[PDB]
Amino acid sequence: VSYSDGHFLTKSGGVINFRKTRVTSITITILGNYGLRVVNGELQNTPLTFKGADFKSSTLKDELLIPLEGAVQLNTAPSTALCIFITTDHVYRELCMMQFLTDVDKTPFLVVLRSESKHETIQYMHIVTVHPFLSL
Amino acid sequence: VSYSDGHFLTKSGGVINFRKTRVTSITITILGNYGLRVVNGELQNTPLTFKGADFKSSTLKDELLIPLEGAVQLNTAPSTALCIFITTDHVYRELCMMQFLTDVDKTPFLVVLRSESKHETIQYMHIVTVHPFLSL
Amino acid sequence: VSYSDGHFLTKSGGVINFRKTRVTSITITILGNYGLRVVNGELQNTPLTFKGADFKSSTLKDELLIPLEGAVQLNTAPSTALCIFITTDHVYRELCMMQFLTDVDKTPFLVVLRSESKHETIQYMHIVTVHPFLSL
Ligand SMILES: [Cl-]
Ligand SMILES: [Cl-]
Ligand SMILES: [Cl-]
Ligand SMILES: [Cl-]
Ligand SMILES: [Cl-]
Ligand SMILES: [Cl-]
Ligand SMILES: [Cl-]
Ligand SMILES: [Cl-]
Ligand SMILES: [Cl-]
Ligand SMILES: [Cl-]
Ligand SMILES: [Cl-]
Ligand SMILES: [Cl-]
């Protein structure tokens, strides 16, 4: 086993940290600096938060693209996440799938796939929890 | 690779069995005594069933806490499950995320995150199937 | 680590290719010939497509069975997928769980579990993306 740490920058200047754990030809990647905790029987959490400005388009479509910048590519299979989308008028709490992909042009992306498009602008997306990311 | 078996007790006296498979610094945990089968082209299943009494609060909130007792901690990333919630008036079939966490006070918990809160009391939660639990 | 390739035939004559990666007693299986890509900032995809004719019953039930034929069994835990169901009147985009199981009679199946039954006939199911399949 070996480990590598890395990060990406979002368009608004946010930093996404990650840690890759390699066991043979499979890698498992976790995102840092967020998650659930139980503190004296009360659930608390720190989400990973994206702004509408971090998306290619801020409309709450059923496919969303977050272009990233950083030193290295990250290419994964999709993983399930619990996300909260804040619009001006609504709060949408939903399971989604997300996947790290690299564009043919070499740009890293995080892609989020949802069930239902809305004609509303994303103010925030909060990732509450996500299954680890697998790469073969 | 090595393997460890364990269990937890729920508040109502239910036993949750699990098996951990360790490969280097990643552990994969499966829960025992439940699942899907196909028998002469017909799907059958044995769910893992929790009572309302097993939850910290039995209200069908969008965050649920199941306090456990047992010999060892179990700390995992979240995994997706298909659950069935039975209330007095309704049956809710839904994908959820669940995660094993340990309280700062050392109490083991199973946490279930859902999309939509209901002002109803849980009679039962049936776990129909769940993706294996990963721990790094 | 070792690798094995295989395939299954569906009732309509479709071929499902898969690749198994074995690391000790855990196997990770990916399905071939489909997935997401980003091409100059635009998301494209090739789904894995099943016909209504591939199911045991074509009704859009909350449990679906796809009987397969091939040289070897494939038995997995459930994984989350984003699927699109096309009926004559509707398009349903949803997260589902799917699992490869073997019948007591030795027939391989792919089983799909959904949240909500509809009294409609499946024309197509498109698998857009699915988390890799784990077997212990
Ligand atoms: Cl952009
Ligand atoms: Cl977008
Ligand atoms: Cl997942
Ligand atoms: Cl808006
Ligand atoms: Cl309690
Ligand atoms: Cl609770
Ligand atoms: Cl999962
Ligand atoms: Cl009630
Ligand atoms: Cl059939
Ligand atoms: Cl069926
Ligand atoms: Cl999954
Ligand atoms: Cl129809």
Author numbering:
A (entry chain A), B (entry chain A), C (entry chain A): 327 to 462
Sentences from the study reporting this entry:
Adenovirus fibres are trimeric proteins, which consists of three different domains: an N-terminal penton base binding domain, a thin central shaft domain and a C-terminal globular fibre head domain. Here we present the structure of the raptor adenovirus 1 fibre head, which does not appear bind sialyllactose, and show that deletion of the beta-hairpin insertion does not significantly affect the stability of siadenovirus fibre head domains. Like the other siadenovirus fibre head structure, that of TAdV-3, the monomer has an ABCJ-GHID beta-sheet topology with kinked C- and J-strands resembling reovirus fibre head structures.
A high-quality dataset was collected from one of these crystals and indexed to space group P213, with one protein monomer per asymmetric unit. The structure could be solved by molecular replacement, using a monomer of the TAdV-3 fibre head structure as a search model, despite of them having low sequence identity (19 %; as a rule-of-thumb, 25–30 % sequence identity is usually considered necessary for successful structure solution by molecular replacement). The final refined model contains residues 327-462, plus ordered solvent (water and chloride molecules). A beta-hairpin, made up of residues 359-373, sticks out of each monomer. Together, three crystallographically related monomers form a compact globular trimer. In the trimeric form, the interaction interface of the RAdV-1 fibre head contains many hydrophobic interactions, with 23 amino acids from each monomer involved, accounting for 17 % of all residues. The basic framework of the trimeric form is also secured by eighteen intermonomer hydrogen bonds (five of these involve the beta-hairpin arm) and intermolecular salt bridges between Arg419 of one monomer and Asp388/Glu389 pairs of a neighbouring monomer. The RAdV-1 fibre head trimer has a solvent accessible surface area of 16.5 × 103 Å2, with 8.1 × 103 Å2 of buried surface; this means that 33 % of the total surface gets buried upon trimer formation. Indeed, we could not identify carbohydrate ligands of the RAdV-1 fibre head by glycan micro-array experiments and co-crystallization with 2,3- and 2,6-sialyllactose was unsuccessful.
